[PDB]
Design brief:
This is part of a larger assembly, with three copies of chain A.
Chain A (H helix, E strand, L loop, with lengths): L1 H14 L6 H10 L1 H6 L5 H17 L6 H23 L9 H12 L7 H12 L6 H16 L8 H21 L6
Helix pairs in contact in A: 1-4, 2-5, 4-5, 4-6, 4-7, 5-6, 5-9
PDB class: ligase
Keywords: E3 liase, UBR4, ligase
Entry title: Structure of human UBR4-KCMF1-CaM E3 ligase complex (Silencing Factor of the Integrated stress response, SiFI)
């Protein structure tokens, strides 16, 4: 199953991210959160490249995300920022991402747009092509995200304009997630 | 100029009073008596002159070196006009509860407005200065809030009864220690709005500062205090939660009054609505969403069944308003936002949750008939609470939530009563689609035992309704039709829950008041309905479907295999039930 | 990182570190500028020149950012902001004298 996620990773790599496949990667990240967190250095490169590409693509569609699917995007982004800050705090040799690039990925999850250059994006795609990884299920994931929404109340206190407003809401959410982790201090 | 301003003839009075007040936060106002207020009114004109003078004097470059010595004096002048304005508002409320007139009202309004402006200039000057611009700004904001909150509380607490009883210092402590809400007006709104602003800032300060980083902060700009201490000070001086809710309720109710007047002081309900909406937002964000333990603890303690009842009342008022309007819509959405926050927040006790549910009339353990139609927020809130309860149990694999089980049982009993009576219900007396959707969702979360019991009860109800054919043959089956639709859904969707159902609830009830709810409908039946129905739009979905436009499938395995298994189990007498269904056709 | 809300909490303890980092580039930049001055007096080289120019530019930029942060903060500013300005001016003047 690790295979299909690299699909939205590569299908979108070709011609921008398909919002349609997005609700898939969000799911993936949250499901693999604990693993990205305490994984083995054997698949460090794989996990690191996964996180970087996921962050970049989620930022690329920051302004355009279903308002209903917007909350799951914020959950997956909190997971990604967790991995990024963990790495920036404990520099790892097996990590396939530079501290500059990791700081820039947090900056993009927390700012208007991502900045990772395409040359570096293809480098990440190659470190992912490394494949150095460790229906009914779709409906199960749907019910999981449904409980997620019940617990995750939007509380969003304070067309094209709405798209920019959705983008700013995502930005506020991820800034909160970074501060949630006291990452500012870290 | 500073000396001249601080040496104003009318200012000196309030200045001294405010200083006395700063000691032991003994907030007091002298126009408590109507006659006292009248005398205050008499002096309005010269008071207006002095206020304007001080305002313009501070407007031109002054107190450039905000050295602590000047900083202190300038803050004093600002808080002094603040107290003057709050006392003017208090005397206006006193005259109102007792009841050049407009001239005096004009003077008073001018005084309050200009007074708040002096405060804001002094505040902006402090915040924009290089000598004392930050912690001093924060303590200036505390002093201001404190004054505003105390005044608002006092004004609201002023009742004509107490007024005539007195018939001079308006000690807030006395009212609290001793412990209609009249006296709230445009001026009250103005002060409340400014007070809300100050409150928001100190709470944002709390949030940025480490969670749960002592004594009540001291009422001094120079005094260095923790943000928590400042908030602690405000709470200790006056009950933050109580005052906020009091203002909220009064504002909303007053707005409604103005609306009614229009249907038949500013007469703009929007004004009060705006204040009310702001209050909701502040509490939800600064408090409800606040992760600070101190804040949450205070909230939980402050929360009372009375508050729940008030909240329920407002919800019902908004839900039963029937007028979207403009600002009303914003307030309505904010209301729901607050309601859902309460439902999700652990601050609301289970006791408080049940209290709110009963006050709405949607208590899941109440007696009588189940409300078939539930109001847009009364339904959304109920659904949120029940679903969160089912999730708690599901998270720990706990047994079927009895409340939701009792919900379904009561609902089915009411439906059988309606079908036994076969009386056509009104739209307000007919089960709403979104309600049906959340009920099916709850039925799913239930374990085999719960869902099988529901199926058996449905079979028994249909069989009993078939016992009297003559009445059924001459009774409108609108409710029986709804029951049969529910049973049919529970035939193609019993073992599993459909993705559309989740989306419908997430879109209809997990949303503040697309406005159109998400659901399916009887194409031919809805066509005939339109043949003789309102032309504007479809106000209420009397005819609908929950089975979805499922691909046409022959009876072969049309009914769920699990559902088939249950029907032939000892619990369900299918052979006898099927005969009743055949008879029901008549 | 500085573009992020990393130094946003100007807590007294953080305030010290926030000032520390700011004047740190200030010193780094003034020293890089002094090195460029030594090179000019002695006179991929163009590449290194551009590198040092970018360094000094971002040095001043970080100084300005932390300054405005301490100025508009509700937990710092006034004399604190004035003293940050004083220290920055000291560093810059001493650098000018040395170069």
């Amino acid at each position: 199953g690790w295979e299909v996620a690299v699909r939205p990773l590569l299908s979108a790599s070709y011609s921008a991210f398909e919002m349609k496949e997005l609700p898939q990667l969000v799911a993936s990240v949250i499901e693999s959160e604990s693993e990205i967190l305490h994984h083995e250095k054997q698949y460090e490169p794989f996990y690191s490249s996964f996180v970087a590409l996921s962050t970049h693509y989620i930022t690329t569609v920051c302004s355009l995300i279903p308002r209903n699917q917007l909350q799951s995007v914020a959950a997956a982004c909190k997971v990604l920022i967790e991995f990024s800050l963990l790495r920036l705090e404990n520099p790892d040799e097996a990590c396939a991402v530079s501290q500059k690039h990791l700081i820039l990925l947090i900056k993009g999850l927390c700012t208007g747009c991502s900045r990772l250059d395409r040359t570096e994006i293809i480098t990440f795609t190659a470190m992912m092509k490394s494949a150095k990884l460790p229906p009914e299920l779709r409906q199960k994931e749907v019910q999981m995200n449904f409980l997620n929404q019940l617990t995750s109340v939007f509380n969003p206190r304070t067309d094209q304009a709405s798209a920019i407003k959705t983008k700013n809401v995502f930005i506020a959410q991820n800034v909160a997630s970074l501060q949630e982790l006291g990452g500012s201090e870290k | 100029l500073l000396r001249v301003c601080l040496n104003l003839p009318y200012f000196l009075r309030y200045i001294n009073r405010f200083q006395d007040a700063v000691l032991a936060n003994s907030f007091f106002i002298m126009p408590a008596t109507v006659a006292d207020a009248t005398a205050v009114r008499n002096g309005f004109h010269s008071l207006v002159i002095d206020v304007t003078m001080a305002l313009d004097t501070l407007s031109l470059p002054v107190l450039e070196p905000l050295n602590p010595s000047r900083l202190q004096d300038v803050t004093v002048l600002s808080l002094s006009c603040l107290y003057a304005g709050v006392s003017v508002a208090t005397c206006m409320a006193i005259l109102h509860v007792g009841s050049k007139e407009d001239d005096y009202e004009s003077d008073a309004a001018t005084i309050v407005q200009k007074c708040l402006e002096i405060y804001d200039m002094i505040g902006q000057a402090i915040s924009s200065s290089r000598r004392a611009g930050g912690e001093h700004y924060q303590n200036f904001q505390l002093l201001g809030a404190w004054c505003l909150l105390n005044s608002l509380f006092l004004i609201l607490n002023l009742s004509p009864t107490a007024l005539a009883d007195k018939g001079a210092a308006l000690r807030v402590r006395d009212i609290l220690s001793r412990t209609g809400h009249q006296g709230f007006g445009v001026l009250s709104v103005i002060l409340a709005n400014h007070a809300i602003k100050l409150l928001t800032s100190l709470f944002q300060d709390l949030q940025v500062e480490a969670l749960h980083k002592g004594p009540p902060a001291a009422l001094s700009i120079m005094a260095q205090s923790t943000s928590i201490q400042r908030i602690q000070r405000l709470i200790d001086s006056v009950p933050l939660m109580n005052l906020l809710l009091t203002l909220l309720s009064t504002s909303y109710r007053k707005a409604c009054v103005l609306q009614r007047q229009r249907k038949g002081s500013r007469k703009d309900p929007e004004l009060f609505l705006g204040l009310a909406s702001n209050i909701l937002n502040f509490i939800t964000s600064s408090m409800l969403n606040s992760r600070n333990n101190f804040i949450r603890n205070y909230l939980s303690v402050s929360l009372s069944e009375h508050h729940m009842a008030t909240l329920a009342s407002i919800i019902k008022e908004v839900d039963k308003d029937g007028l979207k309007g403009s600002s009303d819509e914003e307030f309505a959405a904010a209301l729901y936002h607050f309601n859902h926050s309460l439902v999700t927040s652990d601050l609301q006790s289970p006791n408080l949750q049940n209290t709110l549910l009963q006050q709405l009339g949607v208590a899941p353990f109440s007696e009588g008939p189940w409300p078939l139609y539930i109001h847009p927020q009364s339904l959304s809130v109920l659904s949120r609470l029940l679903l969160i309860w089912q999730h708690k149990a599901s998270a720990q694999g706990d047994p079927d939530v009895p409340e939701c089980l009792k919900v379904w049982d009561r609902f089915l009993s009411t439906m059988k009563q309606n079908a036994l009576q076969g009386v056509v219900p009104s739209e307000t007396e007919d089960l709403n689609v979104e309600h049906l959707q959340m009920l099916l969702l709850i039925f799913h979360n239930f374990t085999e035992t719960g869902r099988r019991a529901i199926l058996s009860l449905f079979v028994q109800i249909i069989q009993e309704l078939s016992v009297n054919m003559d009445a059924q043959m001459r009774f409108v089956p609108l409710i029986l039709a709804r029951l049969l639709l529910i049973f049919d859904y529970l035939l193609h969707q019993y073992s599993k829950a459909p993705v559309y159902l989740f989306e419908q609830v997430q879109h209809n009830l997990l949303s503040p008041p697309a406005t159109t709810p998400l659901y399916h409908g009887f194409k031919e039946v809805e066509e005939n309905w339109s043949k003789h129905f309102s032309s504007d739009a479809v106000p209420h979905p009397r005819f609908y479907c929950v089975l979805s436009p499922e691909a046409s499938e022959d009876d072969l395995n049309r009914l769920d295999s699990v559902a088939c298994d249950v029907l032939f189990s000892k619990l369900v007498k299918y052979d006898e039930l099927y005969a009743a269904l055949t008879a029901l056709l008549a």
